[model samples]
Target: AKLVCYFTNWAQYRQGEARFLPKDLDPSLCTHLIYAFAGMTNHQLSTTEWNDETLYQEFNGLKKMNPKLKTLLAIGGWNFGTQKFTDMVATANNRQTFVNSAIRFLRKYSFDGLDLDWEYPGSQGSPAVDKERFTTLVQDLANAFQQEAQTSGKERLLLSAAVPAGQTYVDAGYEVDKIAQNLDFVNLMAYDFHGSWEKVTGHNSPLYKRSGAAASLNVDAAVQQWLEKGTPASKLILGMPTYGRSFTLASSSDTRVGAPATGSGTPGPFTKEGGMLAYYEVCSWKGATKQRIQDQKVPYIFRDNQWVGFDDVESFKTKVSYLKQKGLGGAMVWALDLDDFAGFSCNQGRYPLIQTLRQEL
Candidate 1:
C-alpha cells in the first residue's frame, strides 16, 4: 500500500505559524513524498521557485530519515497552464528534449522519479490532438528512463502523474490503456467534484454520490470511470484532500447540500484562498454545526452563511476501507502541508489526517 504525500514548495512563503518547510515533515508517515511543482522553460524542466534547487536537496534529504521513502519532483499545476505542454509534445524532437532533460534533472536533484501534473492536455484551451501526443510523450519518457537505467546501471526512475477525475476530462485527454502500460501508477485527483465555482453548495470530495448526483461526480464513480475506460485498479491511487472547499451561503436558514451560494467563503488565515480552508483552519472555528451526508460518506459544516465541505479522520477511515475493498493501489493526500502539521490546532497530533490514513492502510 502507498500513501503518496504532496508538499507544495510555496508553503514556505506563508507567514508566521502557518509557514511550512520540508523539515516539518515526518519521514515515516508517507510512503512517497512528491514535491509540487517544477515548471517548464522553453521545452525543458525548470524550477518554479527561486529556492527550489536548495529545497530539492532538503526534500530528498528526508529519504535519510526513512530509507524506504521515495521522493519525486512534480512538474506543472493548475496555474502552470497547458500551452507549454502542447508545444513540448507537438513533435518527437521536443518530447525527446523534455525526456532527456527530465532524466538529468531528476537524477541531479536526487529525486527517485518524476510526476507530471499537466492540468490537462485537452479541454483547457488545448486541442484534442494533444491527447495522443500526451500518450506519446509519456511513452518516450518511460522508454528513455529504461534505456538510461540499462546503460548507466541505475535504478529505473519511477513515473507517475496527477490526473483529473471527471469523465469528460478523462475521455478527452488520456489514453488510459497506454498510460497504464507505461507509468508506474496514476494519482487520480478525485476531489474538487464541487466548489465555489458552482452556484449551489456541494461537497469538495464526496466518497459516493447523492440520490440525484451526477454519474461522474464522486470518488466511486471517478474510480469506476477510469477502470471502465482501461486503467487497472491496482495502478490507480485515489487522491484525498486535507482541506475543504468553502462557500458563502445565500441564506443561513436554507443551509444544506444544495443551498444557494452567494459567493466564495472567507479565506483561510494561512492559505489565504478565497474558496477553501485547511483542515486545521476548519477545526479552529468555533460554534460550527457539523452534519454528514450518510449516502456520500463525507461531512460538511456550516456557521451563519459560511459553509464548508471537507474530509476528516472519519471520512479518511471510510475511504481507506473503500480503497481496500475496491483493490485500488493506495491513497494520496493533495498536500501534507494543508493538514494539521502542527499539533496545536486540531488537537489530534501533527498531520492527523495523514496519520489516520497510514494507520488505516
Candidate 2:
C-alpha cells in the first residue's frame, strides 16, 4: 500500500511570500490527498464554501498534477459532535438518505472516496449517542457505496476511518471485525499518547513501550492488536504527527517520564499566534535545543527555558522500519503544513522532515 498525506482545510499554503499552493509537494509519493473535516456541519467547511463545482475544480487540479493521487472528503472531526449520527443511522430510511447524499456528493466532486472521522460513535465531547450503531452505520454506508458503484458502472471508491487507538474507543465505537470488513483501510491515530494535559513529561509519540508503562499499546502494539482483532495488516495505516506537544520545564535537568512538570507546560505552536507551535516553528525558535533520549527512541527540544518533547527524523526512521517489518500498510503524516518552510530558519531546511522521511522510509 502507498502512503497517505493529509492537508487540513484550515491551512493555506504559501509560496514566495504570497498565499499560493505549496511548491514542495511531490504528488508521486502520495496515494491519497485528504481534505480534513469536509462535511462538518458545525464549522460549515470553513474557508471555502462547500459546492460541487468548487470541489470538482480543486480535485481536477490535483489530479492533473498527479493522476495517481486519489482525493477524499473526510466527514465529521473531533469537534463535530455526532449526536445526529446515531439517529441518522438508526433506521434504513435515514441510512439511505445519508448514503445517497454521500454518493451524490462524491460523484459531483469527482472524489475517489469518503473518510469518516466521527471523533467517536458512543462517546461524549462531540455528541452523546449509542455505540452499537457504529458498525451498522459503516456497513450500511459500504453497502450503499457498493450498490451505487455497480449501478453507475464506476469503480467503487475507498471507505476508511480514523479510529482511536485505545481500548475504550474500540469498545465505544463498535466491533472491530464488523467495521473492518466495510473499510478499505483503518488510519489508527497512534500519536497524542502524551501531551500537556498530563501531570508529567513524556514523549509525544513513542516507538516502543516505556519501562514503567504497560506494554502492547504503542504504535507496533496497536497494529498487532488490530491485526489480531481481524483487521488485515495491509489495510492499516499508522498515524504520524508532524507537530510536537509542549510543556513548561521547572528546571532544565528535571527528567520525568510521561506528561510535563506541572505548572510549566503549555500547548503547542500553530500557524496562528496561539497554542502550540508547528514543527517548523519549533525548529525556527531561537532557543530551540534538541537532546536524544535513546531509551524512548525520540528527541526533545528546549526553547526559552520551556521544554517541548517530540519525535524527529531519526525516531521516524525507526518507526517506519518497524512498520515495514510488520508488513503493514504505509504510514500517514498527521498534516502537511507543519513541515519546515522558507520562513523557519530553525528547521534544517524547507521540507527537511518530509524529505528525511521520504528518503529514509
Candidate 3:
C-alpha cells in the first residue's frame, strides 16, 4: 500500500508548536514522502525555497531510518499556476529541456520520483492546447525516465501527478487514458469540495454526496469521475487532507451542512489562515461541539461563530475502507505538516490521521 505523505518546505516558517522541519518527520509512518514543491526556472526544474537544497538533504535523509521509504519531488502547486507549465509544454523541445533537467534534479536530490502538480492544464487561465501538451509532457517524461535508467543501469524514476477532483477541471484539462498510461499513479485531490468561498457551510471532503444530490463534489463522486474517465483503479491514489475548511456561522442555531455562513472562520494561532484549520487546531478548540454527518461519513466542529469540517480517525478508517472496497491503488495525505505532528494538540500522538492511514490501509 502506498501511503504518500507530502511535506511542504514552507512549514519551517510556522512558529512555536506549528513549526515543522524535515527532522520532525516519522520515517516509519509513511511509505512515501513527497517534497511539495519545486518550481520552474526558464522551464527547467528549479528550487522554490531558499534552503531547498539543504532541505532536500534532510528530507531524503529520513529514508536512512527506513530504507523502504521512497521520497519524491513535486513541482508546481496552486500558486505556481499554469503559466510556467503552459510555456514548458508548448513545444517538444521545451518539454525535453524540462525532462532532462528533471532527471538530473531528482538524481541530485536523491528523489525516487517526480510529481507533476500543474493544478490544471486547460483550466485556470490555461489554453485548451494545454490538454494535449500536458499529455505530451507526461509521455516525454515517462520515456526519458526509462531511457535514462537503461543507459545508466540505475533504477527507473517513478512518475506521478496530482490531479483535480472536479469534473469540469477533468473534462477541460485531462485526456485520462493518455496520461494514465504514462503516469505510475495519479493522486486524486479529493478534498476542498467546499470552503468559505461559498455562502453556505460544507465538508472539506465528504466521503459520499448528500442523498439525492446530483452534484459531483464529494470524495466518492470524485473517485468515480476519474474511474469513469478511463483511469484504472490500481493507478488512482486518493488524496485526503489533515486540515479542515472553516467558516463563520451567520447564526449559531443554524448549523448544518447548508447553514448560512457569513465569511471565513477565525484563523488558528499557528496556521493563521482564515477559513482553514489544521487538525491540531480543530482538535484543540476548547468547548467546540463536534457533530457527524452520517450520510457523508464525516464530522464538523462548531463553537461560538466558528465552524470547521475535517476528517478524524474514524473518518480516515472509513475512507480506507472505501479505498479497499473500490480496489484503489492507495491513499495520499495532502501534507504531513498539517497533521498533529508534535502531539501538542489532538493528543492521540503525532500524525494520528497519517498513522491511521498506515494502520488501516
Candidate 4:
C-alpha cells in the first residue's frame, strides 16, 4: 500500500497569512508527494512559479531526511485548465512532443515520475475523441518512459492520473481497462461528489450511499466501479480530502442532510475559499451543532442557516479501514495543506489525519 499526498504549489499564499513551505513538510508522513501543478503552455509543459525550478529542488530535497520519500510533479489540475492537455495529446506529434518534454523535465527536477491531472478527458461538452486521445497519450508515454529508463539506467518514471469519481465522468471520458493497463496506479478523486453547486446541501465526499442516493455518487461506488471496470484493487488509490465543503441553509429550522441551500457558507479564517474550509478551520468551528449522517458515514455542521460536511479523525480511520478491506492501494490525501497539518487546532498533534492514516494504512 502507498500513501500519496498532494501539495499545491500556490498554497504558499494561503489567506490566513500562515504558510506551508517545503520546510514545513514531514517527508516521513507520506510515501509519495505530488506538487500541483506545473501548467502547460505552447504545447509544452510550464511552471506556475517565477522560480519554480528552485522550488522543485527544495521540495524534493526533503528525501535527504527520510531517504525513502519519492516525489512527482503533477501537471494539469483544475487550475491548469483542460484545453492545453487536450491539445497536447490530440495527435501523435503532440503526444511525442509532450512526452519528450516530460522526460527531460522530470530528469532535470529529480522527480521520480509525473502525474497527469487533466480535469477530465472529455469536458467543455467535448466529443469522445478527447477520451481516445487521452488513452493514446498514456500509451505513448508508457512506451517512451520505459525506453528512457533503459537508456539512463534509472528506475522507470512512474505514470499516474488523478481521475474522476462520478460514474458520469467514467462513462464519458475514460477507457478504464486501457488506462489501468498503462498507468502504475489510478488515483480516484472520490471527493467533491457534491458541493455548493446545487441548491440542496450534500456532502463533499460520502463513503457510502445515502438512502435514495444515486448509488453511484459515493466513494464506495467509485472504487467498486473502478474494480468492476477491470482496474485491479492494487492499482487504485482512494482520495481523502483534508477539507470540507460548506453551504448556506435555505431554512434555519431545517437542518436535515437534504435541506435546501441558497449559496455557499462563509469563508474560513484561514482557507478563505468560499463554501469550503480546511480541517484546521473546521476544527475551530464552535458554531451551531455537529451531526453525522448514518448511511453516509460522515459528519456535518449545521448552524445559523449554514451547513458544512467534512472528515476528521474518526472518518479518516474508517476510510483507511475501507482501503484495507478492499485490498486497494492506500489513501491519497487531496492536499497536505488542508489538513490540520500543524495539529494545533484539533489539538490532535501534527498532521492529525496523516497520523491516523500512517497508523492504520
Measure candidate 1: CA RMSD.
Answer: 1.1
lDDT of 3 at 346: 80
For model 2, the run of ten residues with the poorest summed lDDT: 40-49
**All candidates' TM-scores?**
0.98, 0.86, 0.98, 0.97
For model 3, residues 117-189, the per-residue Cα lDDT tens digits are 9988999899998998889889899999999998978789999999998878987989998899999999999
Instruction: Pick out the ten consecutive residues of candidate 1 with the lowest summed lDDT.
Output: 207-216
Q: Residues 151-189, candidate 1, lDDT per residue (tens digit)?
A: 878789999999998878887889988888898999999
Query: Residues 50-96, candidate 4, lDDT per residue (tens digit)?
Result: 76888899888988887789888899877667778777877779778
In model 2, what is the error at residue 279, expressed in angstroms?
1.2
Q: Candidates sorted by lDDT, descending order?
A: 3, 1, 4, 2
Model 1 lDDT on a 0 to 1 scale: 0.90
Tens-digit lDDT string for candidate 2 (1-361):
5577676655554333322233434566567766675653322222243343454466446778788788777887765677666566667776677777778777777778888888788776433345657777788778888888879998897788888877766766657877888998888887777666666766677777673335644676677778789888888887777777677766656655553465435544345432244676566557466787676687778765467766667777887787888777877777766665344544376556665566655
RMSD of 4: 1.4
